[PDB]
Paper text:
In phylogenetically diverse bacteria, the conserved protein [name] plays a central role in RNA-mediated regulation of amino-sugar metabolism. [name] contributes to the control of glucosamine phosphate biogenesis by selectively presenting the regulatory small RNA GlmZ to the essential ribonuclease RNase E for inactivation. Here, we report the crystal structures of full length [name] [name] at 3.40 Å and 3.25 Å, and its isolated C-terminal domain at 1.17 Å resolution. The structural data confirm that the N-terminal domain of [name] possesses a kinase fold, whereas the C-terminal domain bears closest homology to a subdomain of 6-phosphofructokinase, an important enzyme in the glycolytic pathway.
The refined model of [name]-CTD was used to solve the crystal structure of the full-length protein by molecular replacement with the two previously collected X-ray diffraction datasets (space groups P32 and [name]). Four subunits of [name]-CTD could be accommodated within the asymmetric unit of both datasets, and the calculated electron density map provided sufficient definition to manually build secondary structure features for the NTD starting from the CTD-based core of the tetrameric assembly. Areas for which electron density could not be observed include regions connecting the CTD and N-terminal domain (hereafter, NTD) of Chains C and D (residues 153–159) and a loop (residues 99–112) that is disordered in both Chains A and B. The same loop is, however, modelled in Chains C and D where the density was unambiguous. The overall topology and structural arrangement of [name] is almost identical within the two distinct crystal forms. The tetrameric assembly is composed of a dimer of dimers in which the NTD and CTD form two homodimeric pairs. The CTD forms tightly packed dimers in a manner that exactly resembles the dimers seen in the [name]-CTD structure. Interestingly the overall assembly is asymmetric as a consequence of flexibility in the NTD dimers. Moreover, the quaternary structure comprises a domain swapped dimer-of-dimers formed through the interlacing of the subunits.
Author numbering:
A (entry chain C): 1 to 59, 63 to 86, 88 to 96, 113 to 135, 143 to 155, 157 to 282
B (entry chain B): 4 to 152, 158 to 280
C (entry chain A): -1 to 97, 112 to 152, 156 to 280
D (entry chain D): -3 to 153, 158 to 189, 195 to 281
The structure:
Amino acid sequence: MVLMIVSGRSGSGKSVALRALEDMGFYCVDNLPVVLLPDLARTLADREISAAVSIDVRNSPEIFEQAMSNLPDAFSPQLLFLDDRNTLIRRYESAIDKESDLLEPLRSRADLIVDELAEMLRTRLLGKERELTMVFESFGFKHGIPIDADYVFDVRFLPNPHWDPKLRPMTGLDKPVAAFLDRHTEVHNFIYQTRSYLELWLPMLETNNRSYLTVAIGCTGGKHRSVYIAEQLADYFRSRGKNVQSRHRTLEKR
Amino acid sequence: MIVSGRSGSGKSVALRALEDMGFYCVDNLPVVLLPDLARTLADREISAAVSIDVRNMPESPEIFEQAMSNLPDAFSPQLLFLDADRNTLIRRYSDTRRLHPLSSKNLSLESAIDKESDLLEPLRSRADLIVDTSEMSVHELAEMLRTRLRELTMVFESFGFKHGIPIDADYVFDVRFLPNPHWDPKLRPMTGLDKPVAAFLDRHTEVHNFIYQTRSYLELWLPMLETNNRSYLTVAIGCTGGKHRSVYIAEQLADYFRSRGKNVQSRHRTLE
Amino acid sequence: ASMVLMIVSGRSGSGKSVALRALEDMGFYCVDNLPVVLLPDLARTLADREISAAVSIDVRNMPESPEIFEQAMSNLPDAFSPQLLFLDADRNTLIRRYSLESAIDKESDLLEPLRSRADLIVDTSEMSVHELAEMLRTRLRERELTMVFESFGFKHGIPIDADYVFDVRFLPNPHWDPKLRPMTGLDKPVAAFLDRHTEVHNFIYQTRSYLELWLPMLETNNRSYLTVAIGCTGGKHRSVYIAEQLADYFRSRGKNVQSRHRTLE
Amino acid sequence: EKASMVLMIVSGRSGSGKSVALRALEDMGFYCVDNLPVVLLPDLARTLADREISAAVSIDVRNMPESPEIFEQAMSNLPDAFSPQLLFLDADRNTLIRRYSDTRRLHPLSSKNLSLESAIDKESDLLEPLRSRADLIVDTSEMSVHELAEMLRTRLLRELTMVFESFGFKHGIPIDADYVFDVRFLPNPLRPMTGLDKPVAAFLDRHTEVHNFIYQTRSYLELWLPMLETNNRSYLTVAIGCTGGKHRSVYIAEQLADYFRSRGKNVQSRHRTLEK
């Protein structure tokens, strides 16, 4: 029932961290006043789940220590701090100067600073391996089914990007193809329903000593629909704390 | 300001704008602890915004009302509600996350959205205003809320075009094509308020159809005009002299919208 | 009786579909690509309805020998007076309208008979869909009621000559998107923005529907002008597009209308 | 033996993109006639029969006879060689409104409609006869015009055969498979027996998780079966795989067939391992 406290300069990705903790099951409350930190736990402790809160420029150490010190035994507090200028500007030094001054009480006593960045948080809260690896690979039926695939799903019935002719040389990773497929509802239903189906058996497939679970998504060419769906399916289970890798057999000279 | 709505309805952009406006915005605060929050800000003397979604909904309306009963006299007790048609929300949802990371497993994406609305009916049913973001863009909801950040008074005024159209008028209706009461020089000195002129125009069906169609046309936009920060909606009925036809119609239009529980005022510019 | 049969012909890309569409607005029953042999049969079906008809004759539809045209033409009921229209545009222009050049010559060659027997010929090299629209209307007058649709900004005041004024300041705003703030309602981006919102279509539809209810009664007493003022705040975005769309609508209704944007002048 | 051609009937509400279909159908070579009166539909066909070319005609609010009986008369008394096929395009009510240019009347030869949404509804009401008897429906609500062009051009307008095959992974994945499901986590069965044998059947039937698996998998396929039935593909091959291809995989495929066979689908089962 940890109380992961998320801190860091404005633009360092604390909003992304809170989202990650949200995926794990933590109750995330943004910009809550520090004084009411006990109240949240007491209200949430009964639910028997962990919680995470954000403390930034929006959110005097006496009240700070007092409020943190004023806390139920059930929940054990942990404090996190995130922290480059050229990168921070991209996420967004008159603002930084006050920000730098204000990042000292907690920063000096911070557990981690933590300065690829998306998944990195998974490594933080343990995780790794001795666990099942989920492989999501795209392929084209004209080239054949990957030899190692365990599940194969045909997506050639979905809307085709070979209909906006400015997309034929693009791949499923390119944002235009993403936006094209994203506007269609059946694409969202397929991703949702396919992973929902896999989650029904994912606890049962984890048994024994399975080393790999390879799910192959197939369209005709293996460059447009299959690539995008496989990546979107992979990204879903990453939010679920799984160890996954995606591989696009056609987009690697084959 | 309480921001609520189905997943994908644009609550995240509202808070960002509202926070930009200067509000203290807190996401996912438990409803019971909403009063406690207010007391902390009272000294600072600033408004606040909070989000209530499927995560925060008590699924028991008493607790919401209970929190309301203990709510301090402060500036911010207003409720905002955003929504969208189901299929648009589905398009907005990036498929790389659970929709209810803290609830059961939803059977279908349209089942999750319906159940979301079903359990979120209490707050909507007693919601101040709804916003159908179905056609609003990413950037459009920002300026709409920024720009949008008492009730509307309907003014029905008759006038004569020969003196000019009222400066404050929002809608102007020309009624100089209607049957003329000057075809009865008994009525030439009488006004539209006098019962003889009323019965004369009432006997003609086209006048009642005009009033019916005119009030019907106004009612089409009246809910959308009521949501603006309009202090007045001025509807001007104009004939040539401003004494016969125009006067009578304004009387009937006012009387109708007054019957609908609307805030109305009547003014006959020429007869004053 | 006395119903018409306007036959529209011309090379592919000369705009017969736009002419055919215009005749449809007037009330014509328009049939595209009907085989010439069935021209009498079509008329007989419409005779009971007592309406005029218009048909297209192209290279796809053109028969192999002119005799069958006259045979079908002669075998059409007396009630119907046939009239033939022929459109032709510049050689290069048709290609732009379609989206070979030797084939286009053959198209002209195969359509020599109808051009020789055309009642009226109209070049469409310089015309735009509006220009040909009123061109057909003119062939089918003057000294009538003139409908003026003018946009204005309420901050500047109401046009003095306005008969109806409609406030549109409750509709979606284009000044929201910071791309469109320097654009006007005439600019295609603002059109697409407002076109995307359904309520804009309903306001235009319902406003013109309301005016048609009283338009016959407003026509009398030798009224020379009916001025409808559409007003937003600045008079450059919403009011311009709505007023322009309203004017364009009644043009299809066979009315004489003018649009004028007080702020954009 | 005999030769036969087609008459594609294009219908749908104003703004649903039937005009694009006719342009596409015209590109393929169809003789396309817009707004032809229904009564003359046979008469038109007779003229084209000799030329031996296909034909396309549009039936919208202008053409529908209000009395639906008249349509059937033309269809029943229609000359042979021409096989009627019906296409119907539709879109969302609010979506059609956005597509509607306001510079022309929507029903230019019918009594004026009360509201923009009443006309679209009445339009739908009057086209229920054609919609109910449509061969294929296309919802254009989410597609632009140019993709609707290429979608129809790419598409042709056959009844679909669903293949359920069991296999063993040690021998390889079937080349012809379209969907593949791994069932190697299910309760394991009997070593010389095959999945067709009732003991292996009763063994797997005894486990409830098998019933949950079949139910969830075929329910999953039904989500896409309407979209796959209208995709010109002649075969949909669903491969169920266990390790040996004789025990678990065999039993699941047969029950999937029996379900879709009970559902009136064209199915065949083939067990790759039990043939060597």
